[model samples]
Target: MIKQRTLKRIVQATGVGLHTGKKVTLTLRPAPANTGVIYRRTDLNPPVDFPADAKSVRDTMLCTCLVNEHDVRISTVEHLNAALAGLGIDNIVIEVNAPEIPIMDGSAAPFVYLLLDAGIDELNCAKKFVRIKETVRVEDGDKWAEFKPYNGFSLDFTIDFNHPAIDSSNQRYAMNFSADAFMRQISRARTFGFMRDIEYLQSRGLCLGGSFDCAIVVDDYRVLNEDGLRFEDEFVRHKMLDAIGDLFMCGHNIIGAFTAYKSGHALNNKLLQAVLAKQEAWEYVTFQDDAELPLAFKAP
Candidate 1:
């Protein structure tokens, strides 16, 4: 059977929040089969557990934020969520001492490394998959995201930035994915920002935790970070990273092809919402036959 998976052991890391500026610690613990990825706030008077779900998404301005009924919020969860999805982690408990996941170099690579280093253990239960049965799409003005039935996983993304620093370089990237493919092509792509935007955010007392060390800071005509870009055309790749993570909020690895153009968290979540609301748009599917599996997500 194609099995559910979890961490082999607990793993932990410490760093600063990208927007909160607070020092924080994050820990990952293996969960039982079918538990799904859940987050717990260790700092609250009474701990709060927040399921990572599309409906749990409460905000999407700068990063994805998940909120519980109690009003407890877990912010900036995209990178960690993406790592879990890419590695085929079906169940896990994420504990954080702050409201946001650490910004660890502003990429999913660090989170991926931590999870892989802890090891992966496949469970006895079969994995659940939400396969798109028909074309489903959502839009916000010109920005949009779509999902279409496919045998395997794929993402085709295009980003258009009017800024010279971004437009002068590549603006689109598309690829079918496997664990190895994600790690190599997309994992190291770091979050990027413009100098003026960062300044404005700081002036408003937001994203104070951001720094030259955590993100690719771009000026009007060039990147300002000294180390340079980790991957060619990393800006859009990071957008892809965010999309992967956002889509994973549906509580499983998707079995569909997703295409987005200048889309962000809000649009991604809306796309999933649109699919879920349409009963005929998707179906819960299982594949015991290797031939029926999309090779991108098929286990070797």
Candidate 2:
């Protein structure tokens, strides 16, 4: 049977938070089975454990943030969560000394590298999965997200941005998680932001650490970054990336087809909560045979 997984050893990395612009160190360590994914704040008086779950979600306007009862919060966790979910990791404990996770390269690729370097180990316990049984939809204005029954994990995402630099036609992508498409096609598309929005964000004391090296910058209809996009449909690919991460808050691997149109963190979180609010929408299950796992769940 497929079993829970965790890191073989602890790994640490340092980078700057996209919002706070302060330097932060993150450490990923192995955790016991059923521990799910938890974030510990090393800078606090008594280290706080902010479990990555829907209940922990506090804010999701620009990025996903998790908060505990003490009001301790962690911001910008979507990339890291995507990396873990894409790799089919189950149990982990992450400790950070900053309010926001570093936007390394503005993609989950760096986290994938660090995780592979740390090595993955399988646990004796069986892994848990949330199997979608019915449609769960959430919408905000024109943006919408939904999940439906599927034998394997899949995502169909579309983004509509009225920007000259971004082609509306090049903003849709679909893939099954069991395929080789994620690492090759989705992991390198960096986050993007508008040039005019930069001043507004700065006025709000945000995005101080953003740079061309980490994110794609757009002004009016032009891309200011010297290098072009990693993928033609990078806009939607990034949306799928964010969705994968936010789904991790379900606290189990998901098995369903997720479709979204211009959905963001808030919409994704709502979709998850809506699905969970109905008992028939999903259920937790485990496989007794490893062969039952999707082909993409294997080590690369």
Candidate 3:
């Protein structure tokens, strides 16, 4: 059977928050089978546990935020989550000493490296998946996202940013899910923001830790980072990265194909909620035979 997996040992890293601009420390610990990914806030008086599940997502403004019953909030969880999903981590404990996660190099590569270095432990239980039985879609104005029944996992994404720097490059990309594909094609794509928008956000005391090192800062005419973009279409790839992490909030890997246009954190979470609400649209499935497993879930 495909088994539930987690870290073999604890691993830790420290960085600065994108919004809070505060230095934070993150610790990852292995969890038992069926635990799923759980986030705990170690900075609070009484530490709070926020299960990384669809309903736990409370905000999607600039980044994904998880809120507990007492209203404790942890922001910017998507990057780490994207890494976890790409690596097929089903159970883990994420402990952070701040309200937000550190934005490491503006991508999931660092998290992926940390998890890999720590090693993975396979548990003795079958892994679970939400297999799509019917197409489910969600929209916000002209933006939309959808999931269709598929034998394996994949994502086809498109972005339409009206800027010279962004428009001059590819705005659409489609990827088949695999550990190698995620690391090579998606993990290195850094998050980006426009100078004008960053200025406005800074003036309002947000994105306090954003800089050329953590993100690709763009101007009207070109990218300001000296090293240039990691990929010609890094912008759209980053969006797809965010969606991968957002979709994992469903607490399991999805057995379906996802397609989206101009979709962001909000729409991605909504899509998960929509699929959950229509219970008949999806079902919990597991593969007892290795031959029946999708490529997306296979060991590399």
Candidate 4:
């Protein structure tokens, strides 16, 4: 069987929150079979468990924030979540000492490295997936995202940033998901923001941790970071990275083709919630035979 997987041992890292600007330590620990992804607020007296689920995502303004019934929240989870999705981690406990996950280099690479250092462990139980049997789509203005039935996972994404720096760079990307391809092509793509927007957000006491070191800072004409772009098409690729994490909020890898245009956290969450609401659109599935596993889950 394609067994469920989690970390082999505890792994931890320290970084700054994208919004809070405070230092936070994140811990990844192994979980039993079918535990799914649990985000624990270690700072709380008794601690609050925010299990990763589509229904728990209550805030998508600047990032994906999971909120519980008691109104406790955890913010900026997309990058770490994208790393988990890319790595095919089925069950794990994600512990954080702050209200947000660290915005390590503003990409999923750091989290991916943390998980690799800890190692992967396969459980006896089978790994499950949400197999899309019908098309599930959501739209906001000109932005839209959709999931179509596919044997393996893939993404087609496009962005419409009219800024000179962004427009001159590539704004469209397509790729089939694989661990190697994800780490090499998608994980390193850093989040970006315009200078004006950054100033405005900072003035309002938001994005306090954002910096040239963690994100691509763009002005009217070019990237402000001395190192420039990681990939010429890094902007769109980052969008795909966010999408992967957003889709994985359902707590299972999906067997579907994702297509999006100008979609961000809000639209992605809506698309996922829509799929969950339509019971006929998808079903839980597991591969008992190794040969039946999708190529996306196989080692590169």
Candidate 5:
């Protein structure tokens, strides 16, 4: 039978926070079974545990942020959470010295490498999951997010940026998480922004740490970065990346199909909370056998 899992050893890394423009050090350590993913701010006088749950979500602008009762906050957590969820990790203690998680390569790939280096160790307890049974949806103008029953964990996403560089044509990407496609293709796709937005963000004293080294920069009809894109549809793929991580705030691995159209962090989190608020739409289950686990469990 498969069981809850955590890091085998503590792993440490350092990088720059996307909005804060500060270098931060993060340490991931193994936690007891059922602890889920918790973040602790070492800089605080009394370290606070920010459980990776919807209730902890405090902000959802360009990224997701989790805050505790003490007002200790952690921003840009999607990439790290994506790595943990993609790998089927259930319990971990993430300690950081700053108010935000590092934006390593602006994707989940670097965190995945760190977790791999630390190794994954299974605990004695079963793994918990939230299974969706009915349609739950949320909408904000033309943007929408929805979850419905499926044979297994899967996602279908469509994005319409209406940019010359980004085709206005809606593109749909689907994946059955039982496959390794997400890790190999989706996780490494970096976040991107238009050049005009960069100027606006800089004027507001935000995105000070963003650069071509960590994100794709587009100007009108051209990509400003010399390195180009990690994928042709990278823009949409990164949206899916954010969706995966934001939905994790529901506090369990979701067994259902999620479909979104131009939805961002706020919409995704709102949809997740909406589903959780209705008991008829979802239920919690624990995985006891490897064979019964979702395809994502078997993915690399």
Candidate 6:
């Protein structure tokens, strides 16, 4: 069977929250079999164990935020989640000092590197997978996301962005999910926002920690960051990265073809909910062949 995995040892990093603008340190620790992903609030005397789940995601405004039963919040989790998804880590205990995760580089690359630094530790238990058995779709006016049965995991995404700078780049990107596909293509694509939106958020004290170091800043007609786009189609690629992370919130490595059009955090969560709500649409499965690796789970 494909074994469940976690970090080889504890690893930590410090950075600022994209929304809170507060310094927070995130630590990833190895977890025993079937522990799943648990978020611990480190500053509290009796730290809270806020287990990660799709239903726990209460806010998706600028980032994914998980709220606990006592209403404790953990913000900006997509990048870390994407890293966890890309690395196929099934069980981990993530400790954070603040309510938000550090928006390191505004992409999953930093988190990916951190995981590599700690190294991957495999568990004896078999990995669980959510395999789509039928078509499941959700729509929000013009935006939509869907999952369909496929031999392996893959994604087809499109963005309807029409700005000059955005228009000049590719609006559609597709990937057959694999470690090579994720690490080389999706990991480095940074989250981006328009200058107008950034200014508005600044006035509202929302994205106080957003900057060129962590995100791609786009003005009305041009890219404003000193360093330019990582890929010609970086925008859509980042969307795919976010999608991969959001899908993992289903609590397993998923096997299906995911397609999205102009979809974001809110819609992605809805899609997961809709898909899971229909019990006949998906089932849990485990790999049996040594060569029967699922997509995006192993390195070349």
For candidate 3, the lDDT comes to 0.90
lDDT by residue (tens digit), candidate 2, 110-198: 99888887888889998888899998888898889999998788888888778777786887888887424667777777888887787
lDDT of 3 by residue, 1-300 (tens): 889999999999999999878899999999999889999889987888999989889665577799887777888999999999989899999999998889989999999989997799999999988999999999999999999999999999999788888764589989999888988899999998888899899999999988898999988889999999888899999998998999999779999999999888888899999999997999999888879998887764
Looking at model 1, report the run of 10 residues with the lowest lDDT sum.
160-169
Candidate 5 collision pairs: 178-295, 178-296
RMSD of 2: 1.5
Q: Which of candidates 1 and 6 is the stronger one according to lDDT?
A: 1
Which parts of model 6 have CA positions greater than 4 angstroms off? none
lDDT of 1 by residue, 1-300 (tens): 788889899999999998789899999999999989999899986878998888889665667789988677889898889888888888999999888889989899999889987788989888889988899988888888899988888999999788676754588989997888888888889988888989999899998899998899988788898888877689999999989999899888778899999998888999988998899998887777647777888552
lDDT of 5 by residue, 1-300 (tens): 667889899999999888877899999999998888898888776766788988778655667789877666788888788777788788899998987898888888998889899997978887778889999999999999899987588888898776777764426677777426768878898988888988899789998878777788888888898978788888888888888888887557898999998888888889989999998998887666567877665636
Candidate 5 lowest-lDDT run of ten:
170-179
Position 30, candidate 6: lDDT? 91
Error of 3 at 191 (Å): 0.7
- Root-mean-square deviation per candidate: 1.5, 1.5, 1.2, 1.3, 1.7, 1.5
Q: Can you tell me which runs of candidate 4 are displaced by over 4 Å?
A: none
For candidate 6, the lDDT comes to 0.86
lDDT per residue (tens digit) for residues 138-192 in model 6: 9989999999999799899999988788864599999899867788899999999
The runs of at least 3 residues in candidate 2 whose Cα sits more than 4 Å from the true structure, single-residue gaps closed, are: none
The parts of candidate 1 lying over 4 Å away from their true place are none
Clash count list over all predictions: 0, 2, 0, 0, 2, 0
The TM-score between candidate 4 and the true structure equals 0.96
Which ten residues in a row are the worst by lDDT in model 3? 55-64
Model 6 C-alpha RMSD vs. true structure (Å) is 1.5
